[PDB]
Design an enzyme around this catalytic site. Sequence first.
Site, PDB file in Angstrom:
ATOM      1  N   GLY A 146     -17.964  -3.931  11.404  1.00 18.73           N
ATOM      2  CA  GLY A 146     -17.012  -5.008  11.799  1.00 18.73           C
ATOM      3  C   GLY A 146     -16.002  -5.057  10.549  1.00 18.73           C
ATOM      4  O   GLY A 146     -15.600  -3.942  10.174  1.00 18.73           O
ATOM      5  N   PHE A 147     -15.996  -6.044   9.613  1.00 12.69           N
ATOM      6  CA  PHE A 147     -14.875  -5.950   8.820  1.00 12.69           C
ATOM      7  C   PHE A 147     -15.294  -5.666   7.444  1.00 12.69           C
ATOM      8  O   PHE A 147     -16.511  -6.175   6.886  1.00 12.69           O
ATOM      9  CB  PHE A 147     -14.288  -7.353   8.696  1.00 12.69           C
ATOM     10  CG  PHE A 147     -12.978  -7.552   7.984  1.00 12.69           C
ATOM     11  CD1 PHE A 147     -11.948  -6.756   7.738  1.00 12.69           C
ATOM     12  CD2 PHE A 147     -13.191  -8.788   6.702  1.00 12.69           C
ATOM     13  CE1 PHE A 147     -10.936  -6.782   6.780  1.00 12.69           C
ATOM     14  CE2 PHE A 147     -11.954  -8.892   5.903  1.00 12.69           C
ATOM     15  CZ  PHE A 147     -10.956  -8.022   6.051  1.00 12.69           C
ATOM     16  N   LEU A 148     -14.927  -4.586   6.838  1.00 10.92           N
ATOM     17  CA  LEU A 148     -15.349  -4.030   5.566  1.00 10.92           C
ATOM     18  C   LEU A 148     -16.971  -4.157   5.458  1.00 10.92           C
ATOM     19  O   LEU A 148     -17.428  -4.474   4.268  1.00 10.92           O
ATOM     20  CB  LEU A 148     -14.753  -4.690   4.412  1.00 10.92           C
ATOM     21  CG  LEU A 148     -13.257  -4.656   4.447  1.00 10.92           C
ATOM     22  CD1 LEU A 148     -12.505  -5.668   3.314  1.00 10.92           C
ATOM     23  CD2 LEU A 148     -12.843  -3.187   3.797  1.00 10.92           C
TER      24      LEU A 148
END
Lengths: 354, 354, 126, 125, 376, 376
Positions: free
Chosen positions: E68-70
């Site tokens: 997903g995000f970072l």
Amino acid sequence: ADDALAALGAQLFVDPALSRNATQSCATCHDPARAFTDPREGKAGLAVSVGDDGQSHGDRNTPTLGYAALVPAFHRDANGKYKGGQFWDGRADDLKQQAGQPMLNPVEMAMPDRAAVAARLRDDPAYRTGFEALFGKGVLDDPERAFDAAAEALAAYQATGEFSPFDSKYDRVMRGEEKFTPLEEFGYTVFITWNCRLCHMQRKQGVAERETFTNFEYHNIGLPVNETAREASGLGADHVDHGLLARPGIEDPAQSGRFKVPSLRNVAVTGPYMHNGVFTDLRTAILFYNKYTSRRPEAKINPETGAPWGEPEVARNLSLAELQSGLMLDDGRVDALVAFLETLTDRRYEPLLE
Amino acid sequence: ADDALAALGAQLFVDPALSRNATQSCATCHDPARAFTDPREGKAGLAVSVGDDGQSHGDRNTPTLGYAALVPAFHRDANGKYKGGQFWDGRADDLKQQAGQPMLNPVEMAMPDRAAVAARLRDDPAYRTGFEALFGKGVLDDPERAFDAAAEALAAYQATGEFSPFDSKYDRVMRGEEKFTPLEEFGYTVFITWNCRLCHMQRKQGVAERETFTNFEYHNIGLPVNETAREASGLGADHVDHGLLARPGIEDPAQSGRFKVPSLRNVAVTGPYMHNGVFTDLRTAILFYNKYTSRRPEAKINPETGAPWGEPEVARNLSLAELQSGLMLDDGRVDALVAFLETLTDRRYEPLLE
Amino acid sequence: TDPRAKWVPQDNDIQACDYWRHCSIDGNICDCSGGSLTNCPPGTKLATASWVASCYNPTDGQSYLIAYRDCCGYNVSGRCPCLNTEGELPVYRPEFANDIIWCFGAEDDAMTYHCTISPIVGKASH
Amino acid sequence: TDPRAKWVPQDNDIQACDYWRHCSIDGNICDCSGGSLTNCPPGTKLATASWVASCYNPTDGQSYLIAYRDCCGYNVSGRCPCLNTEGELPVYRPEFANDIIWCFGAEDDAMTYHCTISPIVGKAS
Amino acid sequence: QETQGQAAARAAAADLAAGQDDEPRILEAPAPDARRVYVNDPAHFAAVTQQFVIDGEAGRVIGMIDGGFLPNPVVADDGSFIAHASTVFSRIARGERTDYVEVFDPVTLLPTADIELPDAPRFLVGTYPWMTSLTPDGKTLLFYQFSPAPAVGVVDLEGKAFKRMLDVPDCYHIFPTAPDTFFMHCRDGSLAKVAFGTEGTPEITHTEVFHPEDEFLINHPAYSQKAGRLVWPTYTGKIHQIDLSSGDAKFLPAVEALTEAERADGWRPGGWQQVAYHRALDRIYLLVDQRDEWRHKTASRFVVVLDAKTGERLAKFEMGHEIDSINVSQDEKPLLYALSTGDKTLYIHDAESGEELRSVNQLGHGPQVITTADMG
Amino acid sequence: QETQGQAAARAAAADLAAGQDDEPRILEAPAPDARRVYVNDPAHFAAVTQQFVIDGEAGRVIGMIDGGFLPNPVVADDGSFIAHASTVFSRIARGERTDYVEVFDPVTLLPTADIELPDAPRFLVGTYPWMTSLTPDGKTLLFYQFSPAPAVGVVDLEGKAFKRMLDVPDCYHIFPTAPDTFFMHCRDGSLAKVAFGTEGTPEITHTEVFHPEDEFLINHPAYSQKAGRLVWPTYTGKIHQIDLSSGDAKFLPAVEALTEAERADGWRPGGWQQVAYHRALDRIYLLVDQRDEWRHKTASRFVVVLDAKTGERLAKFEMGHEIDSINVSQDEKPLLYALSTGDKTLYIHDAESGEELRSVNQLGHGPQVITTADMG
Ligand code: HEC
Ligand code: HEC
Ligand code: HEC
Ligand code: HEC
Ligand SMILES: [Ca+2]
Ligand SMILES: [Ca+2]
Ligand code: NA
Ligand code: NA
Ligand code: NA
Ligand code: NA
């Protein structure tokens, strides 16, 4: 052996003297005029066959012998899947092991024992000559040898070109000799892109040499009991036909309810369908698959009865990964599959297609 | 006239004859030695100031007059935000409108009316001379004119360089005359990147010619009542200080509890802090802001009392979008901000930083 | 452009990575997805937190603190990507650190990175 | 290289977009993300649906039916993207249409596209 | 000579000619080994991202994992599992945030755990390997939190549950040294030792301050948990080495990775993962180039190698590409991985000669992080 | 000739010099007008995607909208809203699927509705504008379902609720003509008129078959809902035109976009959105090039413009780029939009001269679909 051995099997195959009361031969239930299946009507229609005593019905539908010789001997492949063998539950390893069984089965040809079979063979001078030429003098005096020899001849006959002629329209079109109609062509295309090809094709990939539209595997596609055939077989309302699990030496409960994938060659002329003959019409057999994919009301209903299909006889081990394909066959694709499956009829049965 | 008017204001600013019992001048509460704030101890310590009757305490803390002359006149900006004015609730439009009010306030200088003020002015030959050369003959015989003239003169004095010298360390640094220490420089950085800059810098973006570390807006940062100050002011346990809503003409309930953002210049020497003088120490004022961001238990406790900060006097209209920044100041950043805020002390009050 | 050469600011095009206020930007310039130099694009949420840098302005010779506030709540714009690090310090000096998503304080607690704005917030003390 | 020129199949490299079996592939070649010519990468789910094309094999001069199947349940691999359309027909002839994500039948109802395999299912005739 | 795609065409054509059948299925990745390398692509802050599992010996992608995000990837050193801490949202990049840890089987890549982290507690930052870390027994994952304050979350991978957040000082990164202990680097220049092997408050102790306030210690130090060696370069290529093998920190003399003449001629480290450490060889590798003092995240084209024990320079390689990150395999004659964010390519080099052996391209949008297991 | 970045630099410098303050805030897009153009990036089957909102007059991005897997965008012709049908999963590209419709305000781009579609009913295909469609009143969104069988779902945008699925025959695409009626193209080569009430099977009528079975009608016809005109090219650039204006389908004479000699020399349309239709000029625009017959999804370098009533060629433009999709604004003096998937760039041309005026680059990973409103 070869030529002479199969010619001996040919004589045995049509001889009602191998049944106790001399009323029936292999050919009575495997009638060569109907792709080696039984045109006779007992108490449950054409679903199951009646034995030599005129009263005993089987619990399974008599399958075609066409193309049975292309089935591998029963084995477990490295991927854990059983394959091949003979009978709907694979309990015979091969044709030779199969052949003696109807002779001694009280529900079929009902000979009391091997000795009684040998006595019948001895009675006919043509069998003394033909068996002795192939297996040696006195063979027919030894019931173990006489019985095994008869089975050998029968299997050899079934392995001849007569049973597996590869001269259907499909074969002619694959040889470049003519074309499918547009409807047959569409059916072929659906068959090879939809879930049918996952079970009713010889190979996972590549090109088969002598395709017979089965991978020889064992699957539970979740069929209901055929109530009238089950009543006629006398096996009892509590009976469950466990398919492959009934083969001696198979103990894995995951095989309960699984049956051998039948060859679809000649399927258009070998109704009624499935291991218990539950559906009379080929269109119904195809529509059965939509029960797993369509959410429409009509998909839940057997068109032959107007009632719901029924619960599976064995509601476990169903091949849901293959059957729940996410796509339903509309009437156009069902019509095309029928046209395609009819091109799998051997040339000599084409006149039966109307 | 400019110098002269400011010179007249200088005399009035320190003259206690403008109080009823003649014991107090502007300079009593706004003492030049303490950045124009009140060093005197009253019933609530230094939180609120005592008037000329020696008994009456206000309800709000006396603010510095340093840099008050940079505040715009009261107005509503195009975004619907009130800005400017004088008093912690903005209820005076500008310094001139503010100046007569303490003179007539019974809890501060306590003169009964404008005619009483004019009479004290007329007593002093120096006022006759100085007022008449600026406003015309007979200005002191007309109470309306005398009072308006006194207010004008006081407003002009407060607009002189004396009140707003721009000679703090911050200013010298920004002129390139010296450098911040590392701790100061880190405090400037924190002050600029953290939520303080949403309120305590003149501009939203860009740079101010004469920065005074306030945007002149009104915010409710949800302070509790200062109990000892509120008891001393006599206003009653059921009193609520509605801040800006108390300005006449302001009717919007969304302005209840909002107070003018104070300039942070000289903050290090003008304790105690906030509109009601509730926190004695600058470090406590900085720590109050962590009550909106920190999840540590200590953040809910006023370090000066060891008790919870207190329910807001006005629990509605809080500036949560700005206050709930998502980031807690650790003790090192609190140290850095104290260091940076001490650099906003005018040169003449540097020795007070101990 | 030699990536390793000293970065040289200009004050003539805000959509270019050598625009003077972008001296410590990391991500994407908001003016390239419907924001502007100091405003967020529609649909995104403006953070109150930022990292800072002192950036020299070649128009007037002054050094300004730029607060790199993020516009948050959208997938990264993919237009005008830039990364500069004038003055940029490691994560343990977070006020000068620019790999951090500075979305704190954004409405609706938006925390995904769309683009950065470059407003001046004060004069540099150096 | 010339995108509009007649496509020329080869039988020497399966990761290139002109490999003969990829004559109507759309998406990415699974051999490039941990699958192989005819198997899916770990973690992905093999669909049972397919679109089919007749692809000419330059080695033996014969045409073979390739029934493309998708490996599903993962974001698109991004390695070895290819789009060829030999005999490809519009969406109302779905059996020959390749913009459709053919993930039907995949385990766990996986319907995101990762890559496509290129197995032979028959000789063309 | 023969590429992977060519060998595969040759085999397929042979199977065809011979009529060899095979069942289309889901492959297993080959068993984890010392030459498996992972590349994480933070995708320049895109809301979804990818990790590539590569056989460094063949130069072949053997699997992928979506994140997903970072996300923060971690790899158990014994090859038994891999895991990440990741962040998703209910409508792409907006709406309800869910932070979670997934653990995966390293051969089927199937998730064997999915453990939700309450209150969206992850720190969202360009990816630093030691901002999420496994304890040496593989039972615990530790992740960093920055908001409202530095904090460390404890995730029980054996019981598959989030445990608690640890309050810590103003410190950064997480280097575990025992099942119950990790170190962090504090703003004040000390390290903090955090003993957390209890539900109660942790015991936090500080070491002496070991660097001055004007030396800047990079975001991507090398840490060998099996050696207890923390190798921490500064922007100028000074290397701090911290020996944590006794369970307490011992600070070695800081040596210069760049020579006197190099530093006088503009040489400095620069990139993303700028430093690697080979445990068995006790060798340090640093990505360096000539650059201005504030272009410290730009790619570099050279790698210097030095003996960690004596500080002796052993090699300086001209890498031949713009390289952002490096790492090494931990087996006897190691590979030197050199990842270009701009080319989206992993260059695989012989660590002894520095020669480029092979490369793996098309690794996402902005790949930045290489991880290997130390299985020996 | 001054760029937008340059203009913005001078304005920002003027504000700084003037001491002008301004509050950083979230901008509104300018009001929808005829020259607003939307570009959707299906991103070559990525799990998440983007749409760019563009002022075609300035050549400037004025907003973006995030989407999931292969979403279907629609734009109200009166400018009052935009919307899409989208798909997300609980773990990036795996886990529970949610299909849904969002409606957005065309100025703040905020979602004004988020309407779940039960049972993951969307058709996941490379994006075809007319696989999801608004009724002329804007109150209803209709989307196509393929699995388990062709069906059409009815979404009430006014009540913000999914209504029901309609059973249709083996047909494709959805061209609405009224609040309760739309047309489809059927496998058998007819169109199907589908009229639906609040319950029951829809009333379905078919036209005559209007094309042979070996004449192939592209996946991207142009459909002007306000004109009731359906413009349907085949792979050879024969164009079918169907007039739905009366409420029933009437077939217009076929016209050829290319001459016999051009077709014999290899000329064929190709791309993605190969055709555009300007309503007020009654003009057809077709992307064409010389190509092999099975390279029909490759880009084309020319646009032919023809009079829809007579089939006369008005213009042949050399586009000067590899163009995959075209569309036009619907005002007087229209713009011709030419999108390159490979360049990720929208080129904006004068539709009358064919001259390139301006371009907007960096439009995602694989932008393919251009939509405009017909506001006149
Ligand atoms: C009364 C009817 C009847 C007679 C007579 C009969 N069969 Fe059958 N045949 C069956 C039925 C019923 C089955 C399926 C039984 C089962 O699966 O358990 C069957 C199955 C077979 C099969 C297995 C084929 C396959 O695909 O599984 C072979 C081979 C076979 N018969 C050959 C023979 C031969 C040879 C004879 C004469 C010796 C014979 N049959 C006599 C009814 C009969
Ligand atoms: C999961 C494997 C599988 C799939 C997929 C499958 N079949 Fe079958 N098929 C079977 C098996 C097994 C039987 C015998 C079942 C039984 O009688 O117990 C069978 C029986 C049949 C029969 C009856 C043949 C006979 O001689 O009685 C027909 C017709 C048939 N299938 C056609 C199809 C078509 C058409 C499709 C695709 C729509 C299809 N099948 C999909 C395994 C499968
Ligand atoms: C008894 C103490 C006292 C005296 C005497 C006094 N003040 Fe004040 N001053 C205050 C207090 C208390 C406030 C805050 C009052 C409020 O906000 O309601 C204040 C506020 C002000 C302000 C508003 C500044 C701001 O930032 O809002 C100005 C200007 C002011 N005083 C000037 C004067 C002048 C001029 C005189 C003499 C005419 C004077 N004061 C006399 C206590 C005093
Ligand atoms: C939301 C606007 C806002 C923010 C953010 C804000 N302040 Fe304030 N500040 C105020 C207002 C309004 C007051 C006066 C409050 C009152 O007395 O009612 C105040 C008062 C103060 C005082 C006491 C001044 C005095 O003369 O009594 C100090 C010190 C102070 N602020 C420092 C800070 C620091 C440091 C920060 C950053 C941590 C900060 N503030 C954040 C609006 C804000
Ligand atoms: Ca039958
Ligand atoms: Ca005070
Ligand atoms: Na029956
Ligand atoms: Na058994
Ligand atoms: Na008090
Ligand atoms: Na009021």
